[PDB]
Amino acid sequence: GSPPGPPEDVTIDEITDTTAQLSWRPGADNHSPITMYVVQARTPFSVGWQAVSTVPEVIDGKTFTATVVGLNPWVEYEFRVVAANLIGIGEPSRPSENRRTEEALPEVTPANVSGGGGSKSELVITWETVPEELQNGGGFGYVVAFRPFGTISWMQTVVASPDASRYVFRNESLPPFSPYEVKVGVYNNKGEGSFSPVTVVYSA
Amino acid sequence: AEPQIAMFCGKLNMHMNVQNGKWESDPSGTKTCIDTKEGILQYCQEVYPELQITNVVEANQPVTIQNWCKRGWKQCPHIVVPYRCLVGEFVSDALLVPDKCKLLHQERMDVCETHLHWHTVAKESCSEKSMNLHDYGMLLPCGIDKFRGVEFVCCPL
């Protein structure tokens, strides 16, 4: 007896924004009954292959389909299935077809929203770009909002490039080294996300 | 304040002196109104030789300019919509969003349209929500005074 051979014919039957239905067929058990199947996934951003959560939570050796859950929207996924018997965990299957999860509203706001400095009468606002795996859809962009500290009305502008990390508000009447409340939000083709927390940024 | 040119056919072109905030007549005293958006871009670059003029767009509200001249700075009011001389990399406008108002925006990669088209889009969008259009600006230039989107502010009645 020895650990099982590779499962076979792993297919993505359906895929949503956060879930995928997987199916496969058994390989050789090598004279010890297969008692468990586990699913792994790989993205362009993972450190190799990684375990994923499934329904059912534990797939027994008599089950050949399962729903993978907790997937990242708008991310290219491949999956593989591994069998285990009493002797040990077996060899992984060949990977499934590559499929991208569906789009969804963006959920992560930009980190380290800050700013400061610049040339005369400039207000410089900066943030860390939201990485591609957290944009959750095409058409990702930012909304930059700022107002003089203590006022109500917001000044807002749409920064349509997902790779943007900086916005400069140039105005000759803007006062020197004056405090501004600043926040940065996100959106994509599915719709509007949230704003970051408010932080205080001074003009030049 | 902001670089911009203003034209009225039959008169010399005007431009905004950014240093003192006054409208001034054509430096050559010969240039009158221009027919193409490309020619307006070239004139912007001519009268602002120190600035990196990369595009032009209509202003959103007209301005009343006095002391229009004829050829040769002779016989020096007209309410005209000026053209803004846009500088360097495209920077989207900052829009005032008062309390209870909403920032909306639309980007269409398959559409390359005029300032008037996007103004109409924004105005109709606010109206269909039983609101009024206040500020708006262009997004994503695809040509000289051509754009792929709009940002705009809708406010309660």
**DSSP summary character for residue B115:** H
Do both B68 and B130 map to the same domain? Answer: no
Residues of B in contact with A146 (CB under 8 A): 94
Same domain, yes or no: B38 and B99: no
- Least Cα distance to A185 among A142, A124, A134, A125 occurs for A142
Residue spans of beta strands (DSSP E) within A16-148: 20-25, 36-42, 50-51, 53-55, 59-60, 65-69, 76-84, 99-100, 114-115, 122-126, 141-148
Contact A143, A125 (CB under 8 A): no
Shared domain check, B98 and B72: no
Please name which of B18, B92, B19 lies closest in space to residue B55, comparing C-alpha atoms. B92
What is the least distance, in Å, from the CA of B66 to any CA of chain A? Answer: 24
Q: Looking at beta carbons, which residues of chain A come within 8 Å of B151? A: 157-158
- Which pair of tokens denotes residue A53? 């959560």
Nearest partner of A114 among A35, A183, A188, A170, judged by Cα:
A183
Same domain, B42 and B13: yes
**How close does chain B come to A43, measured CA to CA in Å?**
27
Q: Which of A120, A157, A161, A187 to mutate to test the interface with B (most CBs of B within 10 A)?
A: A157
CA B81, CA B76: separation in Å to the nearest integer?
A: 19
Amino acid in the structure at residue B114: T
Residues A1 and A26 occupy one common structural domain: yes
Residues 6+ apart with CB under 8 A from A156: A143, A144, A145, B94, B95, B97, B103, B153
Q: Which residues in chain A are followed by a discontinuity, with C-to-N distance exceeding 2.5 angstroms?
A: none
State the structure-solving technique.
X-ray
Q: State whether A138 and A122 are in the same domain.
A: yes
Q: Which of B69, B65, B38, B70 is nearest to B54 (CA)?
A: B38
Tally of domains within chain A: 2
Residue where the block lists tokens 């409340």: A181
Set of chain B residues whose Cβ sits within 8 Å of the Cβ of A165: none
Domain match, B48 and B98 both: no
Report yes or no: A141 at the B interface, CB cutoff 8 Å: yes
Residues A191 and A113 in one domain: yes
Same domain, A59 and A135: no
Q: Which domain does B72 fall in, by range?
A: 1-91
Query: What is the extent of the structural domain holding A197?
Result: 102-204
Q: Identify whether residues A106 and A199 lie together within a single domain.
A: yes
Whether residues A135 and A185 fall in one domain = yes
Residues B108 and B75 in one domain: no
C-alpha–C-alpha distance, residues A94 and B141, integer Å: 46
Query: Looking at beta carbons, which residues of chain B come within 8 Å of A187?
Result: 105
Domain boundary among A101, A133, A167: A101
Q: Do residues A10 and A38 share a domain?
A: yes
Nearest C-alpha in A relative to B141: A160
Question: Contact A199/A146 with Cβ under 8 angstroms?
Answer: no
H or E segment and range at residue A189: none
Rounded Cα gap, residues B43 and B31, in angstroms: 9
Find the largest Cα–Cα distance for chain B. 52
Q: Are residues B58 and B102 in the same domain?
A: no
- Final residue of a structural domain among A72, A101, A130: A101
Q: Tokens at residue B33, please?
A: 């109104």
Q: Where does a domain end: B91, B117, B147?
A: B91
User: Other C-beta atoms within 10 Å of A34: how many?
Assistant: 22
Same domain, B23 and B74: yes
Residues of chain A positioned with their CB less than 8 A from the CB of B137: 157
User: Could you tell me if A109 and A76 lie in one domain?
Assistant: no
Task: Count other C-beta atoms under 10 Å from residue A3's C-beta.
Answer: 18
Give the residue from A82, A79, A84, A61 showing the smallest Cα distance to A69: A79
Which two three-digit tokens encode residue B92?
A: 């989207």
* Separation CA A49–CA B45 (nearest Å): 56
Q: Do B142 and B66 share a structural domain?
A: no
Residues A180, A125 share a domain:
yes
User: Is residue B8 located within the same domain as residue B69?
Assistant: yes
Looking at the fold, whether A95 and A123 belong to one and the same domain comes out as no
Q: Compute the radius of gyration of chain B from its Cα atoms.
A: 17
Q: Does B59 touch chain A (CB under 8 A)?
A: no
Place of tokens 């959103």: B60
Could you tell me if B95 and A158 are in contact, meaning their C-beta atoms sit under 8 angstroms apart?
A: no
Residue B74 C-alpha, separation from nearest chain A C-alpha, in angstroms? 33
For residue B81, the Cα-to-chain-centroid distance in whole angstroms is 7
Residues A111 and A90 reside in one and the same domain:
no
Chain B window 122-151: which residues touch A at a Cβ cutoff of 8 Å? 137, 139-140, 149, 151
Q: How far is A137 from chain B (nearest CA, A)?
A: 14
**CA pair distance A82, A51, nearest whole angstrom:** 10
Instruction: Please say whether the dihedral angle defined by the alpha carbons of residues A135, A189, A127 and A200, taken in this order, is positive or negative.
Output: negative
Q: Cβ(B95)–Cβ(B151) under 8 Å?
A: yes
B17 touches chain A (CB under 8 A): no
Domain boundary among the residues B72, B91, B110 is at: B91
- Based on the fold, state whether residues B111 and B122 are members of the same structural domain: yes
Domains held by chain B: number? 2
Among residues B68, B91, B114, the one where a domain terminates is B91
Domain limit, last residue, from A101, A120, A150: A101
A115 and A96 part of one domain: no
Residues B2 and B50 in one domain: yes
